[PDB]
Amino acid sequence: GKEVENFEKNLEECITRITNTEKCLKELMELKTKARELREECRSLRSRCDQLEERVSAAEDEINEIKREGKFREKRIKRNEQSLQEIWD
Amino acid sequence: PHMSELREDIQTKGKEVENFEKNLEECITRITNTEKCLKELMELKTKARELREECRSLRSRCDQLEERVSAAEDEINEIKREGKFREKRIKRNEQSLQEIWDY
Amino acid sequence: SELREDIQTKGKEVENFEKNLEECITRITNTEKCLKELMELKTKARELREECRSLRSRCDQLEERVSAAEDEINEIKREGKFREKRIKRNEQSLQEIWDY
Ligand SMILES: [Cl-]
Ligand SMILES: [Cl-]
C-alpha cells in the first residue's frame, strides 16, 4: 500500500511526539513541589529578617541610652575633678 | 447498477480517508501548540535552580547577621554592667566630696 | 473480484487508524489540561523572584545598620576606658585627702 504507508508514518510520528510531550509534563510536575519548598524558604527568611530588625532596633536604642548616660556621668566626673582641683594638688 | 455499486465503495472509502486526514490535521495542530508551551515551561527548571541558590545565599547572610547581632548584644550588656559599676563609684566620690565640704 | 476486496481491506485499515487517532486526541486533551495547570508556575516563579529581591534589600540594610552599631560600640568602649582612668584618679585623690 502507498497511502496506508503514509498514514502509518504520520500516526507513528504522532504517538512519538505525544509520548515525548508526556515525559516532559511528568518532569515539570516536580516544579510544583519545588515551588512550594521555595515559598516556605522565603517565609522562613522573612521571619528571620523580622526578628533581626527587632533586635537591631533594640540594640540601636540601647546604644543611644548608653551614650546619653555616659555624657551625663562624664559631667559629674568633670565636676569631681574640679572640686578636687580646689582641695588636693 | 454495477457502476452505482462501485461509486458507493469509492465514496464510502473516500469519506473515511477524508475524515481521517481532517482528524490528523487537528492532532498535529494540538501537538504543535502543546510543544510550544513545554519549551516555554522548560525555562522554569533553570529559574527554580537559580531561586534555590538565591535562598541558600540569603540563609548564610542571615546566619552571619545573627552571629554579629548576638556579639553586639553581648557587648552592650557588658557596657551596661560596667556603667552601672562606674555609677556606684561616681556617687561614692560625690558623697566623699560632700563630707569634706560639711567637715 | 480482487480489487473490491483490497478497496474494503484498505478501508478497514483506515478505520483502525481512526480508532488510534481517537486514542491520540484523548492523550493530547489530558496533556493540554496539565499545561494549563503548569502555567500557574510561571506566575509563582515571578513572585518568588520578587520575594528574594526584597529579602536581599532587607539584608543590605541590616548589614549597614549592624556595621554602624558595631562602630558605635567600639567608640563607647574606648570612651569608657578613659572615664575609668578619671574615676580611679578621683578615688586616689579622695583616699589621699581622707588618709591625711
Ligand atoms: Cl561610661
Ligand atoms: Cl568621680
Author numbering:
A (entry chain C): 63 to 151
B (entry chain A): 50 to 152
C (entry chain B): 53 to 152
Give verbatim lines from the article.
The L1ORF1 protein (L1ORF1p) is known as an RNA-binding protein, whereas the L1ORF2 protein (L1ORF2p) harbors the necessary catalytic functions, consisting of an endonuclease and a reverse transcriptase. Mammalian L1ORF1p has a unique architecture, even among the ORF1ps encoded by non-LTR retrotransposons. It consists of three structural domains, connected by short linkers.
We therefore tried to obtain a detailed crystal structure and indeed, a bacterially expressed fragment of human L1ORF1p, encompassing the entire coiled coil domain (hL1ORF1p-cc) crystallized with two trimers (T1 and T2) present per asymmetric unit, yielding two slightly differing structures of the trimeric human L1ORF1p coiled coil domain at 2.65 Å resolution. Trimer T1 forms an extended rod with an overall length of 150 Å. For the polypeptide chains A and B, all 14 heptads are found in the electron density in a continuously helical, extended conformation. In heptad XII, chain C begins to deviate and breaks the threefold symmetry, and then becomes untraceable in the electron density in heptad XIII. Trimer T2 is highly similar to trimer T1 for heptads II to XI (r.m.s.d. for Cα atoms = 0.781 Å), but, in comparison to trimer T1, heptad XII also remains roughly threefold symmetric. Apparently therefore, the N-terminal heptads of the coiled coil domain are deformable and can switch between an α-helical and an unwound state. Most strikingly, in heptad IX, there is a sharply localized distortion in the helical geometry of both the coiled coil bundle and of the individual polypeptide chains. The distortion is caused by the stammer, which can be precisely assigned to residues M91, E92 and L93. Arginines (heptad III, R135) are much more rarely observed at d-layers, and especially the combination with a glycine (G132) in the preceding a-layer, where the guanidino groups of R135 coordinate a second chloride ion, is unique so far to the human L1ORF1p.
